Design an enzyme around this catalytic site. Structure first.
Site, short mmCIF file in Angstrom:
data_model
loop_
_atom_site.label_atom_id
_atom_site.label_comp_id
_atom_site.label_asym_id
_atom_site.label_seq_id
_atom_site.Cartn_x
_atom_site.Cartn_y
_atom_site.Cartn_z
N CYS A 33 -8.19 -25.33 -34.44
CA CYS A 33 -7.09 -26.16 -35.82
C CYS A 33 -6.46 -26.85 -35.04
O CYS A 33 -5.95 -27.04 -33.71
CB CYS A 33 -6.16 -25.54 -35.60
SG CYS A 33 -5.12 -24.66 -37.05
N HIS A 38 -10.67 -21.49 -44.09
CA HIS A 38 -10.17 -21.77 -42.89
C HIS A 38 -8.49 -22.70 -43.92
O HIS A 38 -7.36 -21.76 -43.53
CB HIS A 38 -10.50 -22.41 -42.64
CG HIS A 38 -9.78 -22.82 -40.90
ND1 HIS A 38 -10.15 -22.66 -39.99
CD2 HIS A 38 -8.95 -23.65 -40.74
CE1 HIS A 38 -9.23 -23.32 -38.95
NE2 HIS A 38 -8.66 -24.11 -39.48
N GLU A 39 -9.27 -23.37 -44.42
CA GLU A 39 -7.84 -24.13 -45.30
C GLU A 39 -7.14 -23.64 -46.30
O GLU A 39 -5.83 -23.72 -46.04
CB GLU A 39 -8.61 -25.27 -45.43
CG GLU A 39 -9.15 -26.87 -44.79
CD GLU A 39 -8.19 -26.57 -43.38
OE1 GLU A 39 -7.21 -27.09 -44.06
OE2 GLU A 39 -9.19 -27.19 -42.21
N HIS A 54 -4.53 -21.36 -44.62
CA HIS A 54 -2.73 -22.52 -44.38
C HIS A 54 -2.46 -22.20 -45.54
O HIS A 54 -0.75 -21.98 -45.47
CB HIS A 54 -4.13 -23.87 -44.03
CG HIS A 54 -4.06 -23.72 -42.67
ND1 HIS A 54 -3.10 -22.76 -41.61
CD2 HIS A 54 -4.61 -24.61 -42.36
CE1 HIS A 54 -3.78 -23.99 -40.38
NE2 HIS A 54 -5.33 -24.26 -41.41
O1 LIG Z 1 -7.70 -27.55 -38.87
C1 LIG Z 1 -7.98 -27.94 -39.14
N1 LIG Z 1 -7.55 -27.82 -40.58
O2 LIG Z 1 -6.49 -26.46 -40.73
N2 LIG Z 1 -9.48 -28.11 -39.69
C2 LIG Z 1 -10.70 -27.53 -38.62
C3 LIG Z 1 -11.81 -27.57 -39.26
C4 LIG Z 1 -12.23 -26.11 -39.10
C5 LIG Z 1 -12.66 -25.00 -39.64
C6 LIG Z 1 -13.24 -23.81 -38.43
C7 LIG Z 1 -13.86 -24.13 -37.34
C8 LIG Z 1 -13.71 -25.38 -36.98
C9 LIG Z 1 -13.42 -25.80 -38.02
C10 LIG Z 1 -11.26 -28.62 -37.69
O3 LIG Z 1 -10.97 -28.54 -36.28
O4 LIG Z 1 -11.88 -29.81 -38.08
NI NI Z 2 -6.21 -25.06 -38.26
#
Ligand SMILES: O=C(NO)N[C@@H](Cc1ccccc1)C(=O)O
Ligand code: NI
Length: 183
Positions: free
Chosen positions: A111, A154-155, A158
């Site tokens: 994150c 994941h998004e 948020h």
């Molecule tokens: O942090 C964000 N968005 O919140 N994006 C993460 C997306 C992610 C999700 C799951 C596993 C790894 C990576 C990032 O580091 O690209």
């Molecule tokens: Ni995140």
């Protein structure tokens, strides 16, 4: 352009609020902030721009992470193998259906808003259907499986004040759920 300066960090209360639904059409300001969220992901994925501006590599960004409590997300998942790439700016994204079968990244998740690494599997739905609007107010329905489904979940998390680490089994953090697919 946005940079790590713009991204708020674990502990900022905006990350624990419920993001407000946007009215349509979007304001110019709202379109511009959603285009800039995409641009950040693009910039974070160019190694020269990312070195020059100290960007962490990211594939997704939710407006709450730049302290805007609105229901917009950007996803940029480059080809990497299959021929499948994902490039989406979504307004009012909603998961309308999903698989019972779970999926997990075998290395856990990261994150932009989290300065630590946290170990632990984060079990999500292998398959999801999302309904959303694009930046111009038109209708989008996504059928997503595996990596992309995990990123979008994941998004959207948020937008509901949820962090990847809330899904981590406190006792057995690296134990996969039975019949969960490894991505
Ligand atoms: O942090 C964000 N968005 O919140 N994006 C993460 C997306 C992610 C999700 C799951 C596993 C790894 C990576 C990032 O580091 O690209
Ligand atoms: Ni995140």
């Amino acid at each position: 352009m946005l940079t790590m300066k713009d991204i708020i960090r674990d502990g900022h209360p905006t990350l624990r609020q419920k993001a407000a639904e946007l009215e349509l059409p979007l304001t110019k300001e709202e379109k511009e902030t959603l285009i800039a969220m995409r641009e950040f992901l693009v910039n974070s994925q160019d190694e020269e721009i990312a070195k020059r501006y100290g960007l962490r590599s990211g594939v997704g960004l939710a407006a709450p992470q730049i302290n805007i409590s609105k229901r917009m997300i950007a996803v940029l998942i480059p080809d990497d193998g299959s021929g499948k790439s994902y490039d989406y700016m979504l307004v009012n994204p909603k998961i309308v259906s999903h698989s019972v079968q779970e999926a997990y990244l075998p290395t856990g998740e990261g994150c932009l808003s989290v300065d630590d690494n946290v170990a632990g599997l984060v079990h999500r739905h292998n398959r999801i259907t999302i309904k959303a609007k694009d930046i111009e107010g038109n209708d989008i329905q996504l059928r997503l499986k595996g990596y992309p489904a995990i990123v979008f979940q994941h998004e959207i998390d948020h937008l509901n004040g949820v962090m990847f680490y809330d899904h981590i089994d406190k006792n057995h953090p690296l134990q996969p759920h039975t019949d969960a697919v490894e991505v």
